[PDB]
Write a protein that binds this ligand. Structure first.
Ligand SMILES: *[C@@H]1O[C@H](CO)[C@@H](O[C@@H]2O[C@H](CO)[C@@H](O)[C@H](O)[C@H]2NC(C)=O)[C@H](O)[C@H]1NC(C)=O
Ligand SMILES: *[C@@H]1O[C@H](CO)[C@@H](O[C@@H]2O[C@H](CO)[C@@H](O)[C@H](O)[C@H]2NC(C)=O)[C@H](O)[C@H]1NC(C)=O
Ligand SMILES: *[C@@H]1O[C@H](CO)[C@@H](O[C@@H]2O[C@H](CO)[C@@H](O)[C@H](O)[C@H]2NC(C)=O)[C@H](O)[C@H]1NC(C)=O
Ligand SMILES: *[C@@H]1O[C@H](CO)[C@@H](O[C@@H]2O[C@H](CO)[C@@H](O)[C@H](O)[C@H]2NC(C)=O)[C@H](O)[C@H]1NC(C)=O
Ligand SMILES: *[C@@H]1O[C@H](CO)[C@@H](O[C@@H]2O[C@H](CO)[C@@H](O)[C@H](O)[C@H]2NC(C)=O)[C@H](O)[C@H]1NC(C)=O
Ligand code: NAG
Ligand code: NAG
Ligand code: NAG
Ligand code: MAN
Ligand code: MAN
Ligand code: MAN
Lengths: 543, 542
């Protein structure tokens, strides 16, 4: 094999090696596979409001679930894969950065996907969102191609379609190739090797999969991704002229460039009939918060600064006027490379569809020390947004009561803000309009302390996740019928409990429970999976 | 008090003493007291169903909250109080029986009650259910009376009525006088001194408060209480001829006798005009479970056995044919003293009102080794009900899915089983009829891991407690209109996070938060309090 791949894994496995799952072969779904019995008939009573009686989502609405390669696959060294930065991080700093977990095995989706798909068909899911592992295709990020990796996703996609799941592919879901980080700092690249290497990678997967996959996302949540570049292991190999503050905005630029160029390739492939016609964009996240004090001009300014730094910095170069928002430029200056007119030519209009991972909406309080004073000082704790960013403010009205129900406190950013969904959608489609509409591409619940339950029946009756999924879907439905939002789909994070980055398998986002103390990693439906099923039975067109 | 009060407390305090609250004086409520602001107006949407639109509880419905003296009061040693078995238990075995808590202070309701009552008025509560501390009235259980104790409840009752809360009094809520346990084993008394001592106590409080308190319960959950008598500190002082197993049914016998004789005294005081005419009963708890497999005769029999040991053993002697359930006698034998003809003269019909602490409904799986094999073997883990008692059975259908949402795993007996309320009330009113009707005398939610929250806004939006209280109230409202249940009130446990017995202040049951890290133990409304308030506004006659 490759000597530099072997060396990279050696580097990763130096304190401790990759562990292997109990099951390392593709599973066979017996024709007789017995699904666990339904919950009692009264279980779903009361979640659905009569406000939505009879309403349907548009024909062709993608009613789906979402995962991510490194979060669900496992098989971290299988069939020629190369390490990502996360494989390195959690094998060297698991105790302080990865909650003592690693993504070696996670849910073993890499080998269990046929069974997972069969279980999704049981619920009536019609769409399967996944991401491709870059280092399964190019184990060193650039150079040679790993055919076994390419063939693996052919099989996944084929299996998904067999079970009635339309496949939606994300190109990059945060799993940066270790090789590229070491060689030139990956997304910190002061030149443009990263764009070229991402373009080569994306081209390859478009060509290999574009006939089967007709909805593409280049990047999952690039703003959240680039904010992680401020830390380990990225800041072991910063290129000179880059530090942990500029690294965030050098990542932003390089990511916008990579997305624009990839999109040009994709459109060339569609326009030439090389691959099936399809649509492409990226997944935004976060929200335009409501001001803590209505009609307070400082709170409105910090709210706008929140949207600018959290959504606008990517959305406006793509769906906007082609530049970064004016407030972002006035605050970060030379740390955020200007978009040359060549840059803008690739990036403006490079979004056929918008997608918002709309987990929640926040509340903005202007910095207590004054916004002007805060934006001058890169060391102020509320820089650059210059709202009070801590939880006692970001979720709390002047009343001291919260905007809504909190989830697990290890993911304290997550709240149930369903009544605010429609205004988020209105703002986004009027501000970042895309010819192909908007997906609600990720939303899900981390039930408080679900990881501390020991008995299955206590886990599976998951009220607040059931409530959150139902509430959010209801507002999506109403957004279509009452606001005329061109809503294309709804993808819940996630169909299984999975490896939640720094929190590892502790944090539980699935509408199915994964038994991590069982060698087979048995899935079990939670009540929320059945609530999702019932909602699609009631509010999808089936004729 | 006597030197015997000093000796008993010296015994209780032998390893570490009773701690004192930062505030040791009765608080006064400033006229400008500022309640915290309301939740957003969308916060309560969607909880109430249309099934109940326009429906109202009967006129005079008691719409209230419940506490118990030792769970909320604190002031464990103040104003002459004597120690209870729990004061001893948690000052001596705290790390193994009390979760390293004790009831020295709890919520400091003993000094804070005027403020608590102002906050309950702001919610439109109209009924306050409370228990009287026996050892505040008789510090030794028997003998001398502590006048400062009697005067304290005079002022509590007066403050309650002033804030528009009808006072509902429980004579005994588990706080056994330590002196009586050392002297003759308290409720394990193989004679009848425990009955005399309880009756003298009940008399004293009936006379003192019966003009202001018109709804009385002798005992809170006597089945649960008596099950504690199998353990510490009660099993350090069993009389000869009593063991951890018979202590439960000796307790059961004496409580029934104490109840009958106390009710007798209650009626004589009413007949003679010494006190206002009211109603007395006791609070049952638990449920008649559904069988795991419907139509399975084994599951149906173990379900009946459950009701017999959990409800029938107190309810049948009082509200039914006046004897213990047959299955109870057949299984327990001479451990359960027979009810004499005289006994029955006091006990039978001694219940003007039924009260059920209707937290939950269970599922009954017949014992897997077979009911016949289990009833004959006191060593069997499932004796005497001879259903599978463990959590993976008591809450789970054969399907593997639960009957309902679980609450916090440290109180796993609690689930949300609102769909089953109307059936429970049908069974109870048809089987244990009371002229005065039935109270839903306790129900509430322990929000999972609420104790691990560190920011207040995360505590107060308490979705599953809010859902639970609304689900339960809704079904209660339907029991009145669709089933014709003479439901006399609904008292939720509890108005404050408080001292939850062996879990101490860790388990959270209040629709208000209590800040145990704050010297003033400040209260904050959770969303559930506002949900309770709004249900009262929508569904009480005014
Ligand atoms: C590189 O980024 C990491 C973030 O992972 C920084 O880690 C911080 O280290 C400081 C040292 O005092 C701690 O106070 C912080 O708590 C750490 N942050 C986190 C989130 O772990 C690290 O300091 C950075 N190093 C350099 C060279 O800038
Ligand atoms: C990280 O890099 C940035 C940019 O080089 C530093 O921020 C600058 O600090 C200089 C002080 O010489 C300011 O006058 C510049 O205006 C700041 N940058 C810009 C362009 O806004 C930052 O301090 C660097 N070092 C850290 C954060 O350790
Ligand atoms: C998770 O799976 C494990 C293993 O399949 C289940 O636990 C085992 O149950 C047996 C009972 O026969 C115990 O004696 C074993 O010790 C358990 N195995 C362990 C702990 O590794 C368990 O029931 C499942 N958990 C849930 C919540 O479904
Ligand atoms: C008195 O009752 C207590 C209950 O608090 C009993 O405590 C048990 O002790 C046994 C033996 O060590 C343990 O196996 C149990 O786990 C304890 N039960 C608890 C604390 O849940 C004690 O055994 C009883 N003493 C006598 C004399 O029977
Ligand atoms: C506690 O005392 C009771 C009193 O009966 C004991 O119950 C008896 O147990 C013996 C042997 O197991 C049986 O032969 C009798 O039939 C039982 N009596 C009754 C009335 O059923 C019980 O065994 C004692 N338990 C302990 C632990 O002391
Ligand atoms: C910048 O913020 C840091 C942290 O609040 C503070 O110590 C420092 O004084 C600030 N500097 C200025 C110029 O405000
Ligand atoms: C009674 O139950 C125990 C379980 O504690 C068991 O070991 C024993 O065999 C059973 N039967 C008897 C004692 O006849
Ligand atoms: C409890 O009180 C302490 C001290 O007053 C306070 O600092 C803390 O924030 C409070 N905790 C809450 C409200 O959860
Ligand atoms: C377990 O086996 C896998 C192959 O499936 C290896 O990649 C891993 O290093 C471990 O030996
Ligand atoms: C998958 O991989 C493991 C080693 O990694 C083997 O033991 C297993 O039989 C299968 O080949
Ligand atoms: C793949 O195939 C192996 C047999 O080599 C099984 O053991 C495994 O469970 C999976 O089906």
């Amino acid at each position: 094999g490759t000597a530099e791949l072997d060396a990279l894994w050696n580097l990763v496995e130096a304190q401790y090696p990759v562990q292997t799952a109990a099951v390392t072969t593709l599973v066979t779904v017996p024709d007789d596979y017995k699904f666990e019995a339904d919950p009692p008939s009264y279980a779903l009573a009361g979640y659905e409001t009569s406000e939505i009686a009879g309403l349907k989502f548009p024909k062709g609405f993608k009613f789906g679930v979402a995962g991510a390669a490194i979060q669900v696959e496992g098989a971290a060294k299988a069939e020629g894969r190369g390490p990502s930065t996360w494989d390195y991080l959690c094998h060297h700093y698991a105790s302080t950065q990865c909650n003592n977990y690693d993504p070696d095995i996670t849910t073993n989706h890499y080998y269990l996907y046929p069974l997972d798909f069969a279980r999704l068909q049981h619920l009536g899911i019609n769409t399967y969102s996944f991401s491709i592992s870059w280092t399964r295709i190019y184990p060193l990020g650039a150079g040679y191609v790993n055919e076994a990796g390419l063939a693996h996703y052919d099989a996944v996609i084929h299996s998904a379609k067999k079970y009635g799941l339309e496949p939606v592919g994300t190109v990059f879901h945060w799993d940066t190739p270790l090789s590229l980080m070491l060689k030139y700092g990956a997304w910190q690249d002061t030149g443009d090797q990263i764009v070229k290497d991402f373009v080569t990678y994306a081209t390859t997967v478009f060509k290999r999969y574009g006939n089967e996959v007709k909805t593409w996302f280049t990047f999952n949540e690039p703003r959240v991704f680039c904010s992680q570049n401020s830390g380990l292991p990225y800041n072991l190999t910063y290129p000179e002229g880059i530090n942990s503050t500029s690294a965030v905005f050098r990542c932003t630029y390089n990511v916008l460039k990579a997305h624009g160029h990839a999109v040009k390739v994709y459109r060339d492939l569609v326009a030439s009939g090389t691959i099936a016609a399809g649509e492409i964009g990226f997944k935004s996240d976060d929200n335009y918060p409501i001001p803590a004090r209505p009609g307070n001009a400082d709170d409105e300014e910090s709210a706008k600064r929140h949207e600018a730094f959290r959504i606008g910095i990517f959305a406006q170069p793509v769906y906007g006027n082609g530049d970064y928002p004016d407030v972002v430029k006035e605050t970060v200056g030379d740390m955020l490379p200007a978009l040359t007119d060549e840059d803008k030519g690739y990036i403006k209009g490079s979004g056929d569809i918008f997608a918002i991972d709309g987990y929640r909406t926040d509340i903005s309080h202007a910095a207590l020390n004054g916004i002007a004073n805060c934006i001058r000082n890169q060391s102020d704790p509320n820089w650059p947004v210059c709202e009070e960013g801590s939880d006692p403010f970001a979720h709390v009205y002047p009343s001291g009561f919260a905007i809504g129900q909190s989830a697990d406190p290890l993911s304290s950013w997550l709240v149930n803000s369903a009544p605010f969904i429609r205004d988020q959608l209105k703002f986004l489609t009027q501000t970042y309009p895309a010819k192909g509409g908007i997906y609600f591409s990720a939303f899900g619940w981390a039930e408080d302390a679900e990881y501390d339950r020991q008995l299955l029946y206590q886990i599976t009756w998951d009220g607040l996740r059931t409530q959150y999924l139902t509430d959010y879907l209801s507002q999506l439905l109403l957004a279509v019928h009452k606001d005329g939002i061109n809503l294309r789909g709804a993808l819940t994070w996630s169909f299984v409990d999975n490896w939640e980055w720094g929190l590892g398998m502790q944090q539980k986002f699935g509408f199915q429970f994964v038994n991590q103390s069982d060698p087979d990693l048995t899935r079990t439906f939670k009540l929320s999976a059945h609530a999702y099923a019932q909602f699609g039975r009631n509010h999808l067109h089936h004729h």
